[PDB]
DNA sequence: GGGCATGCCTAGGCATGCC
DNA sequence: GGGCATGCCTAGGCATGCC
């Protein structure tokens, strides 16, 4: 169905300088997970692991939140919540811990929480903030996306936003970032094409 | 889910000398329903009316009626029932009179019916059997089928066969003709490959 | 645990004349289910089908069933009971019919029985024997294997023998024959590999 | 199944200059245990003896124990809790002390205590710290690990460090080291190949 | 229709146990 | 200990959708 509103994808650094990172991996044709920064787009297949870190100037106080939700990124689509397709929302593969409609998973994380918000529709997973040890630079989430952009009934071939949302324990906002994804079978060949079309 | 038994699909002309026909549309890019007598296929597009013709030496008695019926052509997936997958199943396209779960749909006939067998689990559609129009040797029935082959969650990608019988007022079996079905974007180009492949 | 007996692996074609047939698959590095009349041999991947053709010169009463139990092939393993490995038996594959430690499962009846036998602790599977359609020659069950020959703590790389009975209602031998099984990553590899050693 | 928290590996030599040390090993392939210094890796055959040797400035106070904990080194794992695979677990090989499902035993001490955590669900073993004998620059202990890291339902190929700590009596942090740990059957040949891709 | 768009299968060859 | 035994991963390439 349709939400009432469309969350900001407006990049917000915040008083903590919050920023994204992603890995180097290469264009291999079926490399796993992969990150175009000429794009900021993430390619990466249905169910595999996917990881993002978190980069802060500062260290946000304990009961800080992190929260991923998708949007479709075109505007005539944006407020259709982003949802499973029918047969993957059926298909036997909870993790136990998340709904079975839920594009967006977090994996390894027992404190993770599944919000439907009763408001807006939309679906998101959250997670506590956890600062690095005082040597490493950056936490690490580890994503799953449960559909390919282009399951039909689902994303149907639309491009999505993922929105990372850093928040206090009231859920209020501390920053922002934002990337594309895509979803499907082969990233490293599907990267390729869409850089290459840049040139076109 | 499975079914308790598997459709006879031996071939019996029986008392009436009844036949199958099919029109001679070639394999040109743009065909909507192509059918080749090397395979015994037919080669359809989704929702679009596909013509079958049946013939008979006599006319059976009024109250006969003609019954279409799809199984998975594979042996060990002859158990499963051949339905819709979830995404069309779901989506809005029944045309008052089909079940949305039904696979093969009877276009062009009020009288049509569709059955749920209570014991079998199986779906068909049955109509009246109606003897040849003036200037015809032949009945022909205009069927639709509502998935492709490919639909995830519902055919994915296996082969059916279409079983048409003949049958009188109890059900009983008068006449019995099948033949493979591949329902698919591109019929003639498929068509074209699969009779290719013959010779390898 | 290990059996009070060893079951009989005795070619008995009895009075139906009971035989098996096996597909022609190629040995293809990965094919899924291949057997080797040289070795009288099926080589087959965990969880895939496994075709197994009942040849008979007349037809057996209703009722009659097919069993089929594995044992370990070399002398000292035989009284060892053939089951799934912990791995596997822990893993969540059931198919809501078979019971997880059953190596043996058939796949697409709903009259299959899983036994374990109180008295001999062996595991086995059984269907009702069905002629062929008036037409066919031959009836076919398929089988699967749901663990590599390899599993440890499971066959831990021995080898097995799938033994096939033909049975009366009561489980009185009407025929029995058999072949042995490797379950494997590579069956064509594997075969192949097996096929040449028998020239060394 | 999985843990609330990720223990720290960071480095931490403390007030009693806590080092690790460890034998010279080379890699003649048979070798049963072989450190890389290049790696910071252990690599050592299942239920082996693993010498590792704690170095200290000046001596801890009475009550001081030390203790080992696994975790998977790839931050997407780090949550899961380390164990052993269905397999060992099940086999007989206890010592007597060690709980069937712990991956690092410590063996030729009595006083060694295995822990089971009710909070992070991780495993560990302890064993009180012994200053060196007179004559000695260094304490050893001695490790075995109970599964490959290859174990298919237990590491299942994934890399693990052994994180080694100083604690006092009431387990707060006095020092803190770890390595890389690889079990498998040739230690040599595995650490010359991995040494050799370095270079890759 | 002709060109893509995009998922699935599998042969090759690497990873890793075994005697 | 070198020679295999054997499972896993994935780039190649086809299957099949789309407009
Ligand atoms: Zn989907
Ligand atoms: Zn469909
Ligand atoms: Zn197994
Ligand atoms: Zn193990």
Known sequence: ???????????????????????????????????????????????????????????????????????????????????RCPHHERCSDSDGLAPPQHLIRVEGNLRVEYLDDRNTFRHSVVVPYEPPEVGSDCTTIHYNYMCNSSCMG???????????????????????????????????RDRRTEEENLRK
Chains 1, 2, 3, 4 share one sequence.
């Open 1 to 83: 169905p349709l939400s009432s509103s469309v969350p900001s994808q407006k990049t917000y650094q915040g008083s903590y300088g919050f920023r994204l990172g992603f890995l180097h991996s290469g264009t291999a044709k079926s490399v796993t997970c992969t990150y175009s920064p000429a794009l900021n787009k993430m390619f990466c297949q249905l169910a595999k692991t996917c990881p993002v870190q978190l980069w802060v100037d500062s260290t946000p106080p304990p009961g800080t939140r992190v929260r991923a939700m998708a949007i479709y990124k075109q505007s005539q689509h944006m407020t259709e919540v982003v949802r």
């Open 154 to 188: 689902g994303m149907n071939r639309r491009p999505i936003l993922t929105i990372i949302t850093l928040e206090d324990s009231s859920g209020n906002l501390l920053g922002r970032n934002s990337f594309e994804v895509r979803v499907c079978a082969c990233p490293g």
